[PDB]
Amino acid sequence: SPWFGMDIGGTLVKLSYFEPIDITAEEEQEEVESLKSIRKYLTSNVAYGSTGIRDVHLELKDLTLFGRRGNLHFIRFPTQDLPTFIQMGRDTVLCATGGGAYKFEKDFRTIGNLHLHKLDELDCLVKGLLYIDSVSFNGQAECYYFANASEPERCQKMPFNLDDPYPLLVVNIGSGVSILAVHSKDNYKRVTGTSLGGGTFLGLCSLLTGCESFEEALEMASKGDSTQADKLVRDIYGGDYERFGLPGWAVASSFGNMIYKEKRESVSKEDLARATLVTITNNIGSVARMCAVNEKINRVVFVGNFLRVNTLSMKLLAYALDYWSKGQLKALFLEHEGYFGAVGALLGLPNF
């Protein structure tokens, strides 16, 4: 049986696959052709069909897991294409998490004799996050922050040590947002969540600009000026609101300048994309700040695929969390940020 961990989210399926690299001469003969075809298919291709992708840069090489050495691979595809995945399987013990482990349980059982083991998505997230940081990213730090995030000429990605990770606030930005407080390896809770997450960015962006992919939405946003759509403090006060330390550049009302018809007629799609990104990102940061204050936790780590290839939102979070907390909170990021649930699911294999 191949060793796989699957996190079926509302938008993306994430798959962690352990490729053994210590296969003995006797073991290669004993392996069945279907198993060899799967291993070869997965390791000789980086694109799978039309929508599956192997994130080769994230591979952990020569990892020791369950007493074997191998490479840990990280693979993603849209949940909309899970029927293709299952149909290919019909042409193994599967540890699965995410909402889709429940929603699609009956579909996975169409694969004869397959044993599906549903695992909790936040249990798997915490276990996978702690594990990956513990083994390191091929000797490099898994965790990083942006040093001097308020000064663009200095701002730079820097490694951050999580050897004693507790306590930790984890902000999981998927379709929506889950906020977790982790006090130990066995003591964690879901503090709250928000509905304004990555699916809001992508959904609103598509409605407003006609973009047809997450990457196109980010490309548009990179070219836009959110202040063409947003109403700033200085638009209301003429400058800073000094009594409460609100700088003129702060957003007072997201999309608030779109109440004027002439401004709706002049705004560009790129401006709207950037305002959508800024609106969602600042709200996530603000909710994270309030939760960190209430939980008395000063390290805030952001995960989920809203931040994949999204340096704009990462840098906005780093700057905003530091600025609005007056330096009391630190924004942290993880190289394997979308895959922790899939890894945590894989890690449950020995229990079955």
Ligand X SMILES: CC(C)c1ncc(CC(=O)N2CCN(c3ccc(C#N)nn3)CC2)cc1F
How far apart are alpha carbons 150 and 104 in whole angstroms? 45
Residues 1 to 20 in contact with Mg ion, rule: CB under 5 A: 9
Pairing of strands 251-253, 231-232: antiparallel
Q: Which does 294 bind (CB under 5 to 8 A by kind): Mg ion, ligand X, a second copy, none?
A: a second copy
Q: Which does 285 bind (CB under 5 to 8 A by kind): ligand X, a second copy, ligand ANP, none?
A: ligand X
With respect to ligand ANP, which residue has the nearer C-beta, 226 or 281?
281
For this structure, is 121 an active site residue? yes
Q: Which does 195 bind (CB under 5 to 8 A by kind): ligand X, ligand ANP, Mg ion, none?
A: ligand X
- The amino acid that residue 208 corresponds to is L
Angle subtended at Cα 191 by Cα 189 and Cα 195, rounded to the nearest 5 degrees: 125
* Least distance CB 264 / a second copy (angstroms): 6
Q: Are 317 and 284 in contact (CB under 8 A)?
A: yes
- The amino acid that residue 255 corresponds to is F
101-110 long-range contacts, CB within 8 A, separation 24+: 101/6, 101/8, 103/8, 104/8, 107/82, 107/83, 110/86
With respect to ligand ANP, which residue has the nearer C-beta, 65 or 173?
173
Catalytic residue among 26, 31, 121, 242: 121
How far apart are alpha carbons 12 and 124 in whole angstroms? 16
How far apart are alpha carbons 61 and 23 in whole angstroms? 15
Binding positions for a second copy, rule: CB under 8 A: 9-11, 80, 98-100, 102-103, 120, 122, 174-176, 190, 192-200, 202-204, 206-208, 212, 229-231, 233, 235-239, 241, 243-244, 246, 251-261, 264, 272, 279, 282-283, 286-287, 289-291, 293-294
Pair of tokens at residue 134: 């513990």
Binding mask 174-213 for Mg ion (x = CB under 5 A): x---------------------------------------
How far apart are alpha carbons 67 and 18 in whole angstroms? 12
Q: Cβ of 156: how many Cβ atoms within 10 Å?
A: 12
With respect to ligand ANP, which residue has the nearer C-beta, 65 or 82?
82
* Least distance CB 161 / ligand X (angstroms): 23
Handedness of CA 197, 311, 308, 226 (dihedral sign): positive
Q: Are 229 and 258 in contact (CB under 8 A)?
A: yes
178 among annotated binding-site residues: yes
SS3 333: strand
The span of 82-90, 133-141, 152-160, 176-184 binding ligand X (CB under 6 A) equals 176-184
Q: Are 308 and 337 in contact (CB under 8 A)?
A: yes
User: Which residues are documented as binding site for acetyl-CoA?
Assistant: 175, 178, 190
User: Which residues are documented as binding site?
Assistant: 175, 178, 190
Q: Which residues bind Mg ion (CB under 5 A)?
A: 9, 174
Q: Hey, which residues are catalytic here?
A: 121
Q: Which residues bind ligand X (CB under 6 A)?
A: 10, 99, 176-178, 192-195, 233, 236, 241, 246, 250-252, 282, 285-286, 289, 320-321, 324
